[PDB]
């Protein structure tokens, strides 16, 4: 089997991407944030505190003839930005782009924090990191990908995120028309439950490539690119007027600037992030100070290749017995 679904930026800055997901019988379609940095499939639901729902589409398991309460199971997650949610668990039929999993754990939110309530366009998350990070207790549950794997033509999924445009998540096959050149595969450590890999270096604009190992995670659920302070300083030094602002919480730059590209290494290959991808617009409405798309990971504790980086590539998440990651230009 295979599946293929279109993923769409939620706003004009590509802050996140939503992908339609069918849950239950009859289908209830929710627009989920596919997140390769987490491993819970959780949704706004009929059980969510009313005051904490603000425009989202909800999953109502009582209306699904295939939903079953997973007795005694709860979940609770806190992401790396202060946001949180928690609730109970059902199993139900979940389909993504024609690919169906029966018995998928669907985590129903009883509580969500303001940060999630405020994103009216995101009806929940579909985690695609390793199932070892799944928060369901007392019996940890598998991700949609983990559940689908055995049935897929090939045990892979791919992320093809667009810049200010729709893109595609495919399951079970590699669309050889979706990228240019070849796919360079690189080793993954699953020891922290992430798609954790090591970049071979970077370049800023037309600058010379610096060979240096940068460990990080491929995370579709993070907007920006978080890299070591040395790397980030080297980048923003090439932008006249750029500075790190403690009040704003990162590097800002004059909105009148044209940004240089940023290149990261994948083995001997190179992925180029165009400068425009690194512009996240005014810090506040009407401001001429703009927020940078490359930020320091210092104090996060991990480097994160988020959407800024991933949308410059066709990315293969290979869940073979020994998982690997593949990157191609596009």
Catalytic pick among 39, 108, 199, 296: 199
Burial of 51 per CB tally in 10 Å (0-12, 13-18, 19+): exposed
* Catalytic site includes residue 92: no
Phi-psi region of 237 (alpha: psi -120 to 50; beta: other; left: phi over 0): alpha
- Residue pair 123/16 in contact (Cβ under 8 Å)? The answer is no
Output the 3-class SS for the chain. CCEEEEEEECCCCCCCEEEEEEECCCCEEEEEEEECCCCCEEECECCCCHHHCCCCCCECHHHCCCCEEEEEEEEEEECCCCCEEEEEEEEEEEEECCEEEEEEEEEEEEEECHHHHCCCCCCEEEECCCHHHCCCECCCCCCHHHHHHHHCCCCEEEEECCCCCCEEEEECCCCCCCCCCCCEEEECECCCCCCEEEEEEEEECCCCCEEEEEEEEECCCCCCEEECHHHHHHHHCCCCCCEEECCCCEEEEECCCCCCCEEEEECCEEEEECHHHHEEEECCCCCCEEEECEEECCCCCCEEECHHHHCCCEEEEECCCCCEEEEECC
Catalytic pick among 14, 33, 35, 119: 35
Question: How was it solved?
Answer: X-ray
- Closest-CA residue to 316 (of 158, 129, 152, 188): 158
* Catalytic site includes residue 199: yes
Helices (H) and strands (E) in the chain, counts: 4, 24
Phi-psi region of 51 (alpha: psi -120 to 50; beta: other; left: phi over 0): alpha
Alpha helices in 194-261, H assignment, sequence order: 229-236
82's CB contacts (< 8 A; 6+ apart) are 113, 115
- Residue pair 94/107 in contact (Cβ under 8 Å)? The answer is no
Hey, what are 275's tokens?
């400068």
- Residue pair 122/16 in contact (Cβ under 8 Å)? The answer is yes
List, in order of start, the domains of the chain with CATH numbers. 5-174 (2.40.70.10), 175-330 (2.40.70.10)
Cross-strand partners of 133: none
DSSP state of 173: -
């Amino acid at each position: 089997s295979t599946g293929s679904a279109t993923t769409t930026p939620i706003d004009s800055l590509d802050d996140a991407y939503i992908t339609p997901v069918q849950i239950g019988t009859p289908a209830q379609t929710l627009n989920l944030d596919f997140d390769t940095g987490s491993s819970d499939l959780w949704v706004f639901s009929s059980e969510t505190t009313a005051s904490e729902v603000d425009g989202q589409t909800i999953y109502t398991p009582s209306k699904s003839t295939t939903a079953k309460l997973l007795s005694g199971a709860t979940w609770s997650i806190s992401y790396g930005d202060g946001s949180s949610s928690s609730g109970d668990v059902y199993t139900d039929t979940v389909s993504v782009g024609g690919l169906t999993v029966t018995g998928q754990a669907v985590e129903s939110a009883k509580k969500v924090s303001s940060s999630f309530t405020e994103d009216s366009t995101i009806d929940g998350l579909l985690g695609l990191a390793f199932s070892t990070l799944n928060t369901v207790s007392p019996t940890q549950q598998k991700t949609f990908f983990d559940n689908a794997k055995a049935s897929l033509d090939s045990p892979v999924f791919t992320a093809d995120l667009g810049y200010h445009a729709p893109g595609t998540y495919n399951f079970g096959f590699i669309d050889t028309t979706a990228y240019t050149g070849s796919i360079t595969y690189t080793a993954v450590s699953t020891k922290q439950g992430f798609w954790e890999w090591t970049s071979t270096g970077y370049a800023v604009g037309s600058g010379t490539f610096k060979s240096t190992s940068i460990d990080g995670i491929a995370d579709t659920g993070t907007t920006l690119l978080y890299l070591p302070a040395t790397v980030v300083s080297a980048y923003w030094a090439q932008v006249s007027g750029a500075k790190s602002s403690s009040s704003v919480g990162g590097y800002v730059f004059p909105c009148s600037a044209t940004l240089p590209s940023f290149t990261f290494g994948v083995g001997s290959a190179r992925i180029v992030i165009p400068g425009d991808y690194i512009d996240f617009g005014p810090i506040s409405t009407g401001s001429s100070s703009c927020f940078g798309g490359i930020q320091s990971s210092a104090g996060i504790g991990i480097n994160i290749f988020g959407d800024v980086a991933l949308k410059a590539a066709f990315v293969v998440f290979n869940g073979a017995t020994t998982p690997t990651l593949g990157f191609a230009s596009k």
